[PDB]
Design a protein around this ligand. Sequence first.
Ligand SMILES: N[C@@H](CC(=O)O)C(=O)O
Ligand SMILES: N[C@@H](CC(=O)O)C(=O)O
Ligand SMILES: N[C@@H](CC(=O)O)C(=O)O
Ligand SMILES: [Hg+2]
Ligand SMILES: [Hg+2]
Ligand SMILES: [Hg+2]
Ligand code: NA
Ligand code: NA
Ligand code: NA
Ligand code: NA
Ligand code: NA
Ligand code: NA
Ligand code: NA
Ligand code: NA
Ligand code: NA
Lengths: 406, 406, 406
Amino acid sequence: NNWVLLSTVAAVVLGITTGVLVREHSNLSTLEKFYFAFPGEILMRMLKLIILPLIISSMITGVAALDSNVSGKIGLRAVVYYFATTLIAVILGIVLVVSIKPGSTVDAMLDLIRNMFPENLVQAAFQQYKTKREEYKIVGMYSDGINVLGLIVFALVFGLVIGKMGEKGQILVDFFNALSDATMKIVQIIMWYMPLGILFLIAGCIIEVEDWEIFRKLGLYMATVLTGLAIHSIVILPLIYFIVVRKNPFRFAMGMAQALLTALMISSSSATLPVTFRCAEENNQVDKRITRFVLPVGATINMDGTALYEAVAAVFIAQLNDLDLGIGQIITISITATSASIGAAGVPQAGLVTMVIVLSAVGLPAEDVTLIIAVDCLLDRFRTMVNVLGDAFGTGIVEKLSKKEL
Amino acid sequence: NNWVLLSTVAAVVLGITTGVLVREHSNLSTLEKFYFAFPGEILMRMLKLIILPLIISSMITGVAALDSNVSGKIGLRAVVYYFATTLIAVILGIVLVVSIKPGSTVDAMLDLIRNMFPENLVQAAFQQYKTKREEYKIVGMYSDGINVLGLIVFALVFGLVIGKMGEKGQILVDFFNALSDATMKIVQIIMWYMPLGILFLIAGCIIEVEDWEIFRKLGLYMATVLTGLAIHSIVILPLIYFIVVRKNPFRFAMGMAQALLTALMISSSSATLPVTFRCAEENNQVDKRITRFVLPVGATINMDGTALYEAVAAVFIAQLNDLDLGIGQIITISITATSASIGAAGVPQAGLVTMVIVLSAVGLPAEDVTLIIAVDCLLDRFRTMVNVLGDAFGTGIVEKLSKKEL
Amino acid sequence: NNWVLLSTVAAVVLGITTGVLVREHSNLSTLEKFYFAFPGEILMRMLKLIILPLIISSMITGVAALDSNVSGKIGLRAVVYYFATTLIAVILGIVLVVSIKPGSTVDAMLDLIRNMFPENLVQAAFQQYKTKREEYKIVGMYSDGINVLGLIVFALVFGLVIGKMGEKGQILVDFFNALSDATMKIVQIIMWYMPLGILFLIAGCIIEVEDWEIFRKLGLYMATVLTGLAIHSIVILPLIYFIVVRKNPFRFAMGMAQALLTALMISSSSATLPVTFRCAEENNQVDKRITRFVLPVGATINMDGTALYEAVAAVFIAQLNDLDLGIGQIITISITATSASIGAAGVPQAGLVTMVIVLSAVGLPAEDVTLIIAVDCLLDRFRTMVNVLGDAFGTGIVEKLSKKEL
Ligand SMILES: N[C@@H](CC(=O)O)C(=O)O
Ligand SMILES: N[C@@H](CC(=O)O)C(=O)O
Ligand SMILES: N[C@@H](CC(=O)O)C(=O)O
Ligand SMILES: [Hg+2]
Ligand SMILES: [Hg+2]
Ligand SMILES: [Hg+2]
Ligand code: NA
Ligand code: NA
Ligand code: NA
Ligand code: NA
Ligand code: NA
Ligand code: NA
Ligand code: NA
Ligand code: NA
Ligand code: NA
């Protein structure tokens, strides 16, 4: 049966029901509220567990599947589509948030480059590099947090190398192919727990707000993000599809509707990836040759919704601090929000972990994330859907562009 | 020649001879006593080095060898036998130690679940998660120590997935098969150093006791553990064998006598595993199809002797602190001593590393292990033999149970 | 075109030109001098990134390629040549530096043995063990820094095991063969950035010296190292070649001249390894059977120039501190400088990272490396060439010795 979507929709409505009723008709202490969320914590453990094997294997196999530079044009065309749509999303976000106004830079910018090239691969798998100036002289240290941006850069370069080796590298192509499949089979196992975990992860999040004045304060911030995500997903992406693929874009989006609902409930572009393959191949009849690369790479590299959210959220917190952003600061937000979408993994609440980078790029305390944290579970559900939809339209686009070489 | 056992028996009697003579006829300072133990430290380095490759590869290959759910019944029947015998050992230990009386809980219990699902596999390979409440709000951090409990859970789930993939996963079945064999060949290399390391590791341990009043104080604690291990290995395990396999159990145990002596000297269920295969297959004529799974998995998951020792040791230290354990606390010791036997690796002195968890489950300082540490090298030799014997009887039992499906 | 050497020679002369002109005609602050070096920092990131995959895979494949103990004599003969030439280099360095005089030991010596056998392979990939005595009792802790000495020992032992397994281990032979090749293909990608990175890494190093009185102070230290490296490479190595291979040694060295210039510019024995294979096989016509083992293992194990430099540098800093070295201390420098050359990786500035060990072996502060750091980029270029030349002559030597078994 079509259990995945119906069970998760039930968990969402049961999570809201539980949270609203428990928040009103009970008085949990700050400690009891933490144990109440525990079944959702264990879900977040299981998903953070799997993003290391998943990102590594999907980067390597995706790139290594480009047998030669002729097929390499399919991969190249896709990464151009990824960067183009992400910048348009960030620019749209900045234009909105400075129109609505809902409210050490060099070191944070060079730290982006240092984190693409980590000094150690094993350390990069769980720690990330930060530099500070003191007395100035620069001092750097590692702090915990998977260096996803550096593992991506290595896995793309390492994937490219393996594919060029031909029959000499095939054992590594085969090893990471099997490891990629084994990882997607483990993710499908987590999907059995995910409905129950999503219930407590939704219920616990709305139990942890003391007053709706917190929700009213952030109402105009949600309007800015949800306005941007609406414009991006309903105007921009359908338009650039139609400009390339002279077919109705909403006909293509309607075929993904089962994947978009999944993304809108589980808040994980990586976990909805099996449903994305199902829709893209069978409803939209896209060539499996390209869907094997554009979907699994784009499921983490191409996060248009996160990039927009990061830019709106960072400028919003700057406005809350009266930090009147100059055009130079706006540009450093744009660059960091672009990189933060790439560095962010496709698991629930990955946008917040990278939010610290965009805040640091303008010197804002890393703890000012706690100004927006309360509503994030709502905007996370919508940004995830744009993270998938951006890849879906890209799959149809890349087919039309590549048709001379497929 | 049969060098392994005769050389290790010599090292044990030479270690006692050296330690007793050096303790009486010399006056090493606390510093010189540490350098005297150094050849035994390097042995402990070599064995801690190998338990990561060994646990990972033996979990994956053991489970992945269950070609289908028909053979999967052999693996399922075994894990039921593992859990049953371990609980009986823990319950026996608790009953004894409260009869003889030789003398934050929720956070430590939820930390067990958080450590089955680590946020990072590379971090889990060398760090383990602990939470504290402060101001309450819960704060968590990682501290060093291989998260064996989380690597087991992943390797069993990852092994299950690979086996279901069939011909698509065979490269990973083959890779971990070779890596499992390569690890057992390295362990056989350490066995050449082990006699010399065991000499200094035994001699140094009895040089580090200042007075025999330490040994007299712990005499009734040793009587409780060694009474429990005697009852478990001479009464309970032979009985549950006979109740399943209507054959004389001591005839089967006599065939293992060469493996039991090895375990009783090297204090390592993992290092004696090659001898366990030799006896189980050739003396006891057990089907190689089942011995390939019950022995190498049970060599670390099924540690009946450690589980009994953990429960007796934790209640003993509680009695030393006048911490009069309620029935609720006794239950939390039972659950944690069960998990601590699984989390403990099959290398000399692995019971102490996990002892900290059972102590923490009742709020006892982690340093109160130093109350029992002095005698542990003796009880380690006996608990190791029950850790092997539990797997040996399980191998004969699982054969009888599975005979309809072999 | 022969772009590698001509482009790097240009970067060196352009780096000196830039550094001298910027140092005179500009006044960078200590902060601006750090950002000026940044394009060279990113080069050091890329090379430190790759030494973990490179050392692991080259140890395993090199040893695992010795199909049997008959070919094993080729590998055995080589490691005898490695240790012999390294000790001769260290002894030459000690004799010089005590003739010219240009100016807790047990714990540091046992720490060498503890670091050959790490308690964890994943921790060894990025941390290294150090012990201290306090109140004495010994306390140990891990600190960051790849434990190259322990990864080598495991990879040689693990490589030996795989080769003995035959057809049962071939999947691991194949896996590390492909991973070794994939790593050398990534290093060849870094070579495209290396000219630009070498320019700023040379220019920035001479911008960071305030006065030439620093260079005059260290002039007699450079004379001691460069005298030792001249004697070792022009006298000793040609002699031991001629004593084994009764052919003109400078005819063989002239065939390597393209590899020696590469080593003398990029300061990386590992990065010049492809050029070393090219010269050794095609100019010097050495059997590919032996060059496949003596070059890639010797590219990190056999560092005769580093070992000489380490001994001269450590005794020099002792003389600066009036620490009048007894014959016992000289011996502990010899042992630690030998091990430090093995522990040092073949990337620019790897000698300094291990310098801390030789200083610690005689109790000198780890920060007294900053007494010699200023000139190190110059001596690094010359020591790298002796690190390659030692392997080159060894390749011709091992061919003559092994000719009865090839
Ligand atoms: N939850 C988003 C990631 C994010 O929130 O940044 C996704 O999986 O696409
Ligand atoms: N030494 C035991 C483990 C322990 O003491 O906990 C064994 O190897 O079975
Ligand atoms: N740069 C040297 C290593 C060192 O300086 O210690 C080499 O690659 O051979
Ligand atoms: Hg929420
Ligand atoms: Hg002992
Ligand atoms: Hg320099
Ligand atoms: Na994009
Ligand atoms: Na995406
Ligand atoms: Na991303
Ligand atoms: Na058991
Ligand atoms: Na066991
Ligand atoms: Na265990
Ligand atoms: Na040498
Ligand atoms: Na070398
Ligand atoms: Na070296």
